[PDB]
Symmetry: D2
Subunit: 287 residues, 4 copies
């Protein structure tokens, strides 16, 4: 149901908000909290494996997570697919396997393989516009259901280019068939993204990821012209802080008693596992 | 080196403490905090996949996590292997694959496949002693490095049998070749496990998992006769509470600003990903024409 | 799509023939030869991994192959699912994952976990009828598309029980919701399976696997009442013989020249990989 | 034991011969026939999955096969690792994972990601010498056991360059630390490869893959100066022919009777599965 659900979110009024996750449990927590969908974060999934976010994990590993989350929740999954895992032929294979796994949208960025993630310091190399437009065209040609979305992510500002270049690239990617564009920035100031949104005059919706420019609200981003806001890695970052503090306290105290009232009870874990339904089906069918 | 490291921990004085994890990042956080090793928790791993802890995930999926953690950290991984994934022949296949993946020890419990999590209420079925002893013998026969450990987990108290039955089973499992035994209990009082520890007289060390009887300290458990203490699911439970609250706050506030100072900074994530070494190696070896 | 295709094969007249395969290439060869569908054989897949056919491979490993075959060919895949990988809760999990991966039908047999391959000698242990009927009921409850099929495999004759017992079990499995039954036997004579078909009065179709009683044709089995005939492991057995002989000849001769005219050319491999389309798409979309 | 075994083969007199395989069964058949080791073939594995040999399969998928073969047989596995799955940092991650899985040697080629099977027509793109030397240096820095081997595969002839270019590339790769070089060629004549061997004066050994120039014997290649000869895809090609003919015959005849005496009996399959030892262990431990 994923791609149909995401199209309905884009076709209805209001700002769409999605949250990063790196396993089915995190996706289920975001769904329960009330997010509209899931972002299958390259950073969260890489970090969960103890590894760089630099196409060190393969498409097989990243798709494995995205697909397991897609089947675990009833909201759409939007996948972070780095640069598309190679050339236009890799992109087509990517689309076929992500679409078949029920992912609603895939996001590819205008860099070359292997991904240099946005937080690497210094000038960064961009893919040429003709080569990246070929990847976008190939993605649209490979998909089977028209509801599936291909999101073209613009790293021009990240890489050291100006807003004119970011808009030139976004307009080319839209012309190549991208269903949405994602303008990225790593400044504290939201102003470069607000400027992009104000100058964007094509019908394709714009996606934003306010990791660094966090002071701007989803409502303000929506009023400025963004359709979807991605909270990409806050679950991971919250988990790291809570788990390291928990482990430190257990070792220092020599027991868990002081943290028992500050962590999830086992009954909450069992609920998140679906144990009520599991036990009912055991009663019905296990003889 | 995991198996050699775990044997050193058991052969040295002091109480060994290990923490549950369900991916390499959790294992690395436990190592950095100072735990002696990792517990590859069936509960944590199944919960992370949104699924019951009931042999719904397969050995393939559980080994994938245990092995990725074993290569990610420099402390031993002790694996929770449910009932051994079938009969003694499945147990042998399990030992071969887990040992090759660098896991230091595997734990199999005296129940029948598929596992019922110990916190399932009501009376639970135990494996017969001859059948489970064969699983233990098969495991010791399949391993290649003598340092590798097979831990026999005793669910007799969980299932509602008495202390003498738990002791009869543990002693049979030790005679069958288990390197250690794990006595489990789900009461809030530590006395049931304390009673087992006082009456255990064999040389094999005893493992305990104080999830429910959490008020007893590791030092007290060690003084009573336990050699290893397992904190099996507190990382998962802490993570669930924090992530839920984070997601709730982001949706309510309309932005993340109010939790930025209460979650790990990006630079901490990068450190945990190994980016210092990665960027050094990029500078050393990645070059153009 | 697989399940609807398989229903169409069962709803139209004629004997359905499927072949065993253990990777997408084998499935594609079976499709090109003209088989109606694929059998995702536990024996072929376990043997391909050098391992016993005894639930040593896990559901994850067996599903990975079945699902990759289902996406690679345009004929339905019928999966060999051993005993269902545990109790009725495991069976439900299996159905959800196999259906999502586009498998058309799953086959579970009335034995206990872990499976003993039907060719293991001596008396074997059967699941109780109530317990197995619970697995069948759970499977039907877990599926989403009504076209998906659950095939109940009867091991009663394999295990040493008589025909009355195989029929009692088959009739119970049909009443529990199985879409088809598979009656197995391992003698050289087809008579035990023919005797079953003579006494089968239920509308559910019957599946047969004539590995040992190979002298009866698919058309003779169909004339006797069977609907689907499974050739379960002949591709693996042919490949083993040919690859062993090829390896021995290369070592003896010192070169491959004497076998070049008797093995597939690389152009055939490229065609099986879809290189014509791959190259066209490179021309259309890979740009500087 | 694999890396030590392969070193012993390279250190002893004689020409090493290995055969391609794409699963543990095929490796076991090569071992039983008497091959010295296994070539974990990118063409055979991709083909077995119905897909192009063009880095469409990922490192995860290719390593899964190579590692399962390495633990299934008692001869060394030499892995076909395409271009190394990205840049020098991908190469390092590859080495760490392949070495931990017991693979004896990895082979990377001097092309850019994603590769094209050498049998693609026209001038092909080579990696620059500095960039590829950096991959080799990284691979050698990442390995832990000195017995593990990194084989530098030279695609210059495949790509339409002359012998002088293939030799100068090989010479640079050897100085960068490659343990052996593989000279590839797709002529029917063996003479280009013989001429490379005559003109190669360096101590690093040379690997050859006589797929197209199949008329030269292993003994003749060894006498000309090659140390290892790879029969890369004959098992797959023999299997395809036999399986297609088997399926055609079953459909035409209506039964398998006419092929029963011409395919492996089930007892041979059981032996290859290890059933004798499996049954003994059943008797020993299953109670
Ligand atoms: O794995 C995570 C769990 O441990 C916790 O942190 O909450 C969300 C999950 O993604
Ligand atoms: O996935 C987890 C991450 O989100 C955090 O919770 O810290 C430890 C990891 O296991
Ligand atoms: O899977 C293959 C089997 O079918 C046969 O062809 O011999 C070699 C194996 O690799
Ligand atoms: O992998 C196999 C290939 O080697 C050949 O044997 O034909 C069928 C395939 O399944």
């Amino acid at each position: 149901h994923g791609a149909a659900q995401l199209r309905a979110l884009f076709d209805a009024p209001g700002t769409v908000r999605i949250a990063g996750a790196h396993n089915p449990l995190g996706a289920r927590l975001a769904e329960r909290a009330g997010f509209d969908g899931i972002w299958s974060s390259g950073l969260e999934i890489s970090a969960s494996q103890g590894l760089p976010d630099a196409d060190i994990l393969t498409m097989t590993e990243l798709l494995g997570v995205a697909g397991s989350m897609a089947s675990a929740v009833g909201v759409p999954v939007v996948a972070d697919c780095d640069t598309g895992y190679g050339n236009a032929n890799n992109v087509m294979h990517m689309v076929r396997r992500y679409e078949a796994a029920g992912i609603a949208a895939v996001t590819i960025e205008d860099k070359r393989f292997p991904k240099v993630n946005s937080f690497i310091p210094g000038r960064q190399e961009l893919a040429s516009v003709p080569e990246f437009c070929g990847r976008i065209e190939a993605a649209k040609d490979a998909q089977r259901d028209p509801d599936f979305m291909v999101i073209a992510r613009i790293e021009a500002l990240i890489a050291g280019w100006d807003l004119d270049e970011a808009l030139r690239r976004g307009e080319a990617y839209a012309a190549a068939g991208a269903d949405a564009v994602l303008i990225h920035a790593k400044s504290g100031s939201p102003q470069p993204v607000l400027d992009f949104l104000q100058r964007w005059h094509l019908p394709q919706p714009v996606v934003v990821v306010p990791t660094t420019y966090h002071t701007i609200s989803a409502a303000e981003l929506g009023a400025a012209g963004a359709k979807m806001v991605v909270y990409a890695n806050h679950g991971l970052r919250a988990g790291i802080q809570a788990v390291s503090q928990t482990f430190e306290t257990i070792l220092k105290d020599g027991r868990t008693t002081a943290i028992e009232d500050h962590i999830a009870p086992l009954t909450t874990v069992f609920d998140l596992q679906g144990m009520d339904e599991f036990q009912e089906n055991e009663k019905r069918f296990v003889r």
